[PDB]
C-alpha cells in the first residue's frame, strides 16, 4: 500500500490531510531480343483478349466512318446506350455524331492494343500522340491539324490516318479545349479520332465525356487470361497448372502485362515448373493498385463475405486501401455523407457520436497542420476511414452514393455571399456605415421585406386616398433608399413575372416556412412604374436645385 497510517522511520515523508482532519503519510524518496509482352502481342482481330462487346462496338464505330473516309456506302444499361448510338444514324455531313471514341479503364487491359489493332484492321494508318510529346496547346493543335486535315503523301492507295491520342487524362485543359474546338469546327473533321485514358473522371475530360463514344473497359475474364497464359507458357516451354496461373491473375488484378512480365521473371531457365508459393510470395509480382473511391467506401462499410476472418487483418486492409486510394478529402466527404444512410444497429447513437468526434478530430488536425506548418500531423487522418470500419461494418449491401452535400453547401454559401455583396453595394454609403452586412442580414432583411409589401388594393393612383398616396410615397422612398426595384422576367409557361432586382427573397425566405401572401402583378407593376417616375422626378428636382 502506498499510503501508511504510521509515519516512516528512515525515508522522508510527505503529509496528506483530509477535510475531516485525518493524517496520512507518503514516501518522498529474335526470341532472346524482345519482351514476352511484345512477342505475344496480338497482330490480328482474332487474338485480342478484351471484352468482345467493346471490340465489336469500337469496330462498328470505326466502320461508321467508312462513307466519309473511304467513300463507300458498304463497308464489306451501358450496353444499350452504345447499341443505340451505333444505330442512331449519321449527321447530314455523312459523319457519325460522336466523332471521338474515348477509351477508359484500369491499366494493362489492352486499350492501346485494341485501338491499334482496330485501326489497322479497318484500313487506317495509326498516328499516335502520347504523353511523351510536348502537349502544349499549340503543338497539340498543329499535330492534330497535321494528322487529320490532309490526305496521304503517297497519293492513291495510301492508307488514311486514324489519330490515336494515348494518355489524354494527363493533358492540360487548354489542350482538351483545342481538341474540342477542332472537333466542333463548322475545317470540317474528315478523319476519326480515338482517345485513350485511364481515369474517366478527370477534371479535364469532363466536357469530353458529353461528346465522345464512351467505351469503358471491364476487367478481363480470368478464364481467357488463364488460357492465354497457358499458351504463352507452353510456347516458352514452361509447365504450369491452371491453378497457379489463376492465382497469378488474382494477384495482379487481371493485368495482362503485369502477369506476362511476372511469368517472364519467374520462369527464367533454371527451373521449368512454376510453384504456387512463388506466386503467393510478395517478393515478385505484387504492385500497388490505386483503389477507386466506391470500392474504398464499399470495403469500409461492408464486411467481407465468408484466414481473413480476424479483425486485425480487416483493420490493416481497410487502412491500406484508404491510404492507397488517395484523395483523402473526398473519402472523408463520402464517409460523412454515407454513414447515416446505413442500417445502423446502434440505436443509442453512440457510434454516430464517436464517428463525429473522429471527424472533428480530422478537421482539427487539418486546421493545426495548415496553421503551424507542421504536416507530420497528417498521418492520423488516414485512420479516419478505418475507424468507420470499426464502427459501421455490416454484412448488408449498402447503396453508397457520391458525396455532394458539402460542395453544394459551399457553392450555395458563395452565391449567398455574392448576393449579400450585390445588395450591400447598391445602398448609399451614408446608411451603409450604420449597419454591418451581418447585422443587416440577421435583423434588417425579412422585416424590410415586410415593410416593402403592404396590403395594397389593385386600384389606380387617381382613385387612391391621401393616406394611401402617402403610404405609396413612403414605400417608393424606402424602395429607392436600398436601390431595389421590380423587373420583368420571362417564364417557360409564357407568363411574365415581376422579381426584385437584387433578389433578396432567397436571402430572406426559407423552404419549410408557412407561406405568405405576395403582391399581385398589377401592384408590383405600379410599384416599378412609380419607382421610375420618382427617379425621373428626383433627377428633375436635382436639376432644379442645381
Amino acid at each position: 500500500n502506498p499510503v501508511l497510517r504510521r509515519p516512516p522511520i528512515l525515508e522522508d515523508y510527505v503529509h496528506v490531510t483530509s477535510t475531516e482532519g485525518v493524517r496520512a503519510y507518503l514516501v518522498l524518496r529474335a526470341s532472346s531480343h524482345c519482351l514476352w509482352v511484345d512477342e505475344f502481342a496480338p497482330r490480328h482481330y482474332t487474338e485480342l483478349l478484351s471484352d468482345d462487346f467493346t471490340n465489336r462496338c469500337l469496330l462498328k464505330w470505326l466502320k461508321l466512318w467508312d462513307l466519309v473516309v473511304f467513300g463507300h456506302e458498304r463497308p464489306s444499361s451501358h450496353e444499350q446506350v452504345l447499341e443505340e448510338m451505333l444505330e442512331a444514324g449519321l449527321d447530314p455531313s455523312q459523319r457519325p455524331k460522336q466523332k471521338v471514341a474515348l477509351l477508359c479503364g484500369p491499366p494493362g487491359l489492352g486499350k492501346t492494343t485494341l485501338a491499334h489493332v482496330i485501326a489497322r484492321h479497318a484500313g487506317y494508318s495509326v498516328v499516335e500522340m502520347n504523353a511523351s510529346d510536348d502537349r502544349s496547346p499549340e503543338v497539340f493543335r498543329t499535330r492534330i491539324e497535321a494528322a487529320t486535315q490532309m490526305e496521304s503523301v503517297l497519293g492513291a492507295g495510301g492508307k488514311p490516318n486514324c489519330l490515336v491520342i494515348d494518355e489524354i487524362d494527363g493533358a492540360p485543359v487548354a489542350a482538351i479545349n483545342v481538341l474540342l474546338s477542332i472537333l466542333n469546327r463548322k475545317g470540317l473533321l474528315m478523319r476519326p479520332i480515338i482517345c485513350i485514358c485511364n481515369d474517366q473522371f478527370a477534371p479535364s475530360l469532363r466536357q469530353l465525356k458529353q461528346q465522345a463514344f464512351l467505351l469503358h473497359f471491364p476487367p478481363t475474364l480470368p478464364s481467357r487470361l488463364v488460357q492465354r497464359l497457358q499458351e504463352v507458357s507452353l510456347r516458352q516451354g514452361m509447365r504450369a497448372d491452371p491453378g497457379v496461373l489463376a492465382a497469378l491473375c488474382e494477384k495482379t488484378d487481371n493485368d495482362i502485362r503485369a502477369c506476362i512480365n511476372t511469368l517472364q521473371f519467374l520462369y527464367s531457365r533454371g527451373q521449368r515448373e512454376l510453384s504456387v508459393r512463388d506466386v503467393q510470395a510478395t517478393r515478385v509480382g505484387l504492385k500497388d493498385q490505386r483503389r477507386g473511391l466506391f470500392s474504398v467506401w464499399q470495403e469500409v462499410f461492408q464486411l467481407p463475405r465468408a484466414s481473413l476472418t480476424s479483425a486485425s487483418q480487416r483493420f490493416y486492409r481497410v487502412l491500406h486501401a484508404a491510404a492507397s486510394a488517395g484523395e483523402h478529402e473526398k473519402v472523408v466527404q463520402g464517409l460523412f455523407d454515407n454513414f447515416l444512410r446505413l442500417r445502423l444497429r446502434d440505436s443509442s447513437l453512440g457510434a454516430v457520436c464517436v464517428a463525429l468526434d473522429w471527424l472533428a478530430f480530422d478537421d482539427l488536425l487539418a486546421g493545426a497542420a495548415h496553421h503551424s506548418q507542421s504536416f507530420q500531423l497528417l498521418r492520423y487522418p488516414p485512420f479516419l476511414p478505418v475507424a468507420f470500419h470499426v464502427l459501421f461494418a455490416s454484412s448488408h449491401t449498402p447503396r453508397i452514393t457520391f458525396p455532394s452535400s458539402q460542395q453544394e453547401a459551399q457553392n450555395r454559401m458563395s452565391q449567398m455571399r455574392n448576393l449579400i455583396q450585390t445588395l450591400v453595394s447598391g445602398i448609399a454609403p451614408a446608411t451603409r456605415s450604420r449597419a454591418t452586412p451581418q447585422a443587416l442580414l440577421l435583423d434588417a432583411l425579412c422585416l424590410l421585406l415586410d415593410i416593402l409589401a403592404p396590403k395594397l388594393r389593385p386600384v389606380s393612383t387617381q382613385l387612391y386616398s391621401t393616406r394611401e398616396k402617402q403610404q405609396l410615397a413612403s414605400l417608393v422612398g424606402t424602395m429607392l433608399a436600398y436601390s431595389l426595384t421590380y423587373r420583368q422576367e420571362r417564364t417557360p409557361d409564357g407568363q411574365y413575372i415581376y422579381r426584385l432586382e437584387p433578389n433578396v427573397e432567397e436571402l430572406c425566405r426559407f423552404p419549410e416556412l408557412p407561406a405568405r401572401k405576395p403582391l399581385t402583378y398589377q401592384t408590383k407593376q405600379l410599384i416599378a412604374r412609380e419607382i421610375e417616375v420618382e427617379k425621373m422626378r428626383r433627377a428633375e428636382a436635382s436639376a432644379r436645385v442645381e
Binding site: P107, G108, F265, G285, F361, V390
Partner: protein
C-alpha cells in the same frame, strides 16, 4: 504510378535478417582482421536493425574508436534502437501501469530525445501494436491530440506524462 509498375517486374526486397548480415560482417572482418567477440557482433546486428549500411558504419566506428568488438565498445558509440523500448512503454500503458511507462518515458527524456521523436515512435508502435482495434483508435486519437499540442509549442515532460496518463485512462474507460 501503376502504369509504370505494370510496365515493369515489381521486385520487393525484404529487410535483412541477422544471419544474412552476419555473413557479410564475417567477410568484412576476415578482410580487415578485426578482433571480435560473439556478443559484439550481436550488438552490431542489434544496432543495424536490418540495415547493412548501419552495420558497416557501426563496425567501422567501433573498430576505429576502440579496436575491439565487444558489447561495451559497440554501445559506447552506437545506440540501442528506439521502438523496441517504446513498445514496452506502450504495453505498460495498455495494462494502465503508469509507473513503468513513466520510467521508460523519463529514461528516453534524459537521453536527449525530443518530444517529436518520442511521439513519432509512440505512434509508429501503436500503429502495429497487438491490442483491441477500438482501443488502438482511441490511443491514436489521443496521440494525435497530444501531438497537436507538441506542434503548437508546449512540449514538456509534463505533456508526455499527461499523454501517458490519458492512454492509461483509455484502458479503464469502457
Amino acid at each position: 504510378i501503376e502504369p509504370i509498375q505494370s510496365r515493369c517486374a515489381v521486385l520487393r526486397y525484404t529487410k535483412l535478417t541477422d544471419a544474412q548480415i552476419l555473413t557479410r560482417l564475417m567477410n568484412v572482418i576476415e578482410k580487415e582482421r578485426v578482433p571480435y567477440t560473439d556478443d559484439g557482433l550481436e550488438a552490431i546486428i542489434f544496432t543495424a536493425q536490418g540495415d547493412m549500411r548501419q552495420a558497416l558504419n557501426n563496425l567501422q566506428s567501433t573498430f576505429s574508436g576502440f579496436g575491439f568488438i565487444n558489447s561495451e565498445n559497440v554501445f559506447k558509440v552506437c545506440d540501442e534502437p528506439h521502438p523496441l523500448l517504446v513498445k514496452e512503454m506502450i504495453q505498460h500503458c495498455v495494462n494502465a501501469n503508469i509507473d513503468e511507462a513513466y520510467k521508460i518515458l523519463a529514461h528516453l527524456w534524459h537521453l536527449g530525445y525530443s518530444p517529436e521523436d518520442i511521439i513519432g515512435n509512440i505512434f509508429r508502435v501503436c500503429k502495429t501494436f497487438q491490442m483491441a482495434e477500438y482501443l488502438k483508435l482511441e490511443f491514436i486519437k489521443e496521440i494525435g491530440y497530444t501531438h497537436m499540442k507538441i506542434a503548437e509549442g508546449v512540449n514538456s515532460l509534463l505533456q508526455m506524462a499527461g499523454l501517458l496518463a490519458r492512454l492509461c485512462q483509455k484502458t479503464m474507460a469502457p
